[PDB]
Amino acid sequence: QCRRLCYKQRCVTYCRGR
Numbered sequence: 001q002c003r004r005l006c007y008k009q010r011c012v013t014y015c016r017g018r
Contacts, residue, residue, distance in 0.1 A: 001015065001016060001017075002014065002015035002016075
């Protein structure tokens with residue numbers, strides 16, 4: 001599934017699966 005995550009300055013989306 002897709003969730004949003006931030007790299008303590010940056011913010012991106014994480015969609016799991018392959």
